[PDB]
């Protein structure tokens, strides 16, 4: 493979613990991955995803020159380092062992993935839900005792646009803490918002830094990925091993009417 | 298929004659197709061909953002029209029948294909041999009694660059007529040029409008095509049928040292 | 093996492309390898080739002390470096990929091999054809319009020495360019030389820097090699891999009458 893990000085048992540490944390942290449908990964050789056609400028001499449009995939590699003594301890069955570097790498990777999915990157050509939306942003009240007003406004905007199915709400953890100081510790406000969302859930996204409402009916956007996050190898030292988390992905919004930003 | 030929008012026998008229003429006229190697066609869904990677501008937060590079394919559609009475005559076994419109369409399509392959298009992103070459152009003498000097100069330039195998010469038909008025009707000059080319042939390309020398060792450039030239259907009239010649292709020069332009 | 390729971070597909790049270029560049017969390689453990005996100085006490003579083999290692991203691209089927470092390493290795075979090294004990010859050098004319005179002189020298079979001519590429500016682009002079060589060919050797004529009858000299040129491994970096081209060889001229130098 291109992730030469056989050439790494890490034992098989420690490989299992590294991979498991990488999986659980990624599933927990991933928020935008749960609001955008993701087709099964193509594999390394995907390269790009084919969009529609496009007439060139000059179709002269009675010929046609429809040029194809393609969106190339981006690859995100996050290197991290693990000590050789820590990896060695897993064979003597050390119990107090921890994998903080893997968690840090997962946090970095998921942060950049979610920022691109929810908002956009504009450097790889990816445009997120919060930027492709055609609806005007729903201004949120400053008090936070009336966020239900903004949620209802977004729900009304989607309803009068033929958006169907449960509306999901994505917020930041900062707004989470700000809501835990409202009335009965934000239990009543959150309950009211859960009713307004037409059966949808409220998702707290640590990686997100913007609020938006997205329909969960599916088919409005897709996440095309060639390689799920994977642990590779770069080099090793006398007392250190260097790995990386590798993932190739790209986000395409087909129907920009299903998402409205709250800001 | 996407070339709905079953919905066309042309008979099966006339389909054979149209297709054969399209094939022979294209094989004759195609010149750049014989100097650039062509892999077997991918089919409609190719979309694009994957090139190497490319580091983005800002790789911040200790992450990598290697963006893929892809060259999208171009599609060339050349519509043409054939009379219903002509198509009808093929069942009564008319002998004086002719297919001039198909030849005209083939000429138009091959002209644009060869101009892109040999020189370039710059609108679909395709760069031809004559433009990707790094060698300085070999100035041709005005007399044409010394074109052997320019050919020898190009042969020397390729030889001292480790270019190997027979060197092919591509000229225009205008230079053909200009050479038929030199000494013994250009039989001696052409013979001398055939020796200088290290066993290669001299190709007269009606579609070409520039002179160049290209090595035939292979592997220096490739022609990626999804759909070979094919006859489709658009509509029919009370006494007319409209078809088109469709071909999706793209040219990539890997080693620009194997071609030198003479101008 | 001693070329630990299993410990290299290069993929199997990229191994094939590296090896093929190393083979083709070496076969093209190798010139002295085509004029000196080469027995099938002994393998690593050859060490040396056994020559005849040699009486020591003092054979006292009515004893004999015939000491053996052996020529030890030399080993030529040429390291080169390849980027990890380039090797990685071969799995995504990148088409614009190139292997310039392998070509540079092959050129360096073949240059030193051919200089030793044709002329000599004098540091590994190897003596080449151009230095073991007993015939006086055939002075070449400065005009190059009379190189046929020197070739005929060498042919006469070999003929009156019982040298048999086709005489091959090895020249430098500098003389090649100098000959392409003589009469009809050196086509006539080269043709005349081809006749003088008694059916032998004219070989242009980029690695060679001296002119000589060698009989191709065979058996006059041999090239003893233990390991054909092979790609090994030294180390790898976070974004780089270091390999080398390894070849152990030695040249012995048995009959110095079959080669004459032109200088």
From TrEMBL, chains A, B, C:
Keywords: Encapsulin nanocompartment. GO terms for cellular component: encapsulin nanocompartment. Its main location: other. Pfam families: Linocin_M18. It comes from the Bacteria. InterPro entries: ENCAP (IPR007544), Encapsulin_nc (IPR051429). It is found in: Encapsulin nanocompartment. Belongs to the encapsulin family. Family 1 subfamily. This is Type 1 encapsulin shell protein.
């Amino acid at each position: 493979n291109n992730l030469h893990r056989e050439l790494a000085p890490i034992s098989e048992a420690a490989w299992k613990q590294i991979d498991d540490e990488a999986r659980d944390t990624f599933s927990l942290r991933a928020a935008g991955r749960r609001v955008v449908d993701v087709p099964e990964p193509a594999g390394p050789t995907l390269g790009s995803v084919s969009l529609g056609h496009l007439e060139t400028g000059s179709q002269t001499d009675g010929v046609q020159t429809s040029v194809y449009r393609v969106q190339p995939l981006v690859q995100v590699r996050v290197p991290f380092t693990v000590s050789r003594a820590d990896i060695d301890d897993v064979e003597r069955g050390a119990v107090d062992l921890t994998w903080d570097p893997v968690d840090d790498a997962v946090a970095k990777l998921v942060d950049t993935e979610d920022t691109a999915i929810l908002h956009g990157w504009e450097e790889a050509g990816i445009t997120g839900l919060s930027e492709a939306s055609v609806h005007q942003p729903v201004q949120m009240p400053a008090e936070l005792e009336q966020i239900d007003d903004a949620v209802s406004g977004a729900c009304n905007v989607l309803r009068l646009a033929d958006v169907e199915g449960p509306y999901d709400l994505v917020l930041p953890q900062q707004l989470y803490t700000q809501v835990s100081e409202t009335t009965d510790h934000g239990v009543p406000v959150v309950d009211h918002l859960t009713q307004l969302l037409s059966g949808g859930e409220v998702l707290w996204a640590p990686a997100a830094r913007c609020a938006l409402v997205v329909s969960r009916r599916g088919g409005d956007s897709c996440l095309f990925l060639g390689r799920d996050v994977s642990i590779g190898y770069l080099s090793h030292d006398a007392q250190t091993v260097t790995l990386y988390l590798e993932e190739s992905f790209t986000f395409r919004v087909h129907q920009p009417d299903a998402a409205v930003a709250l800001v």
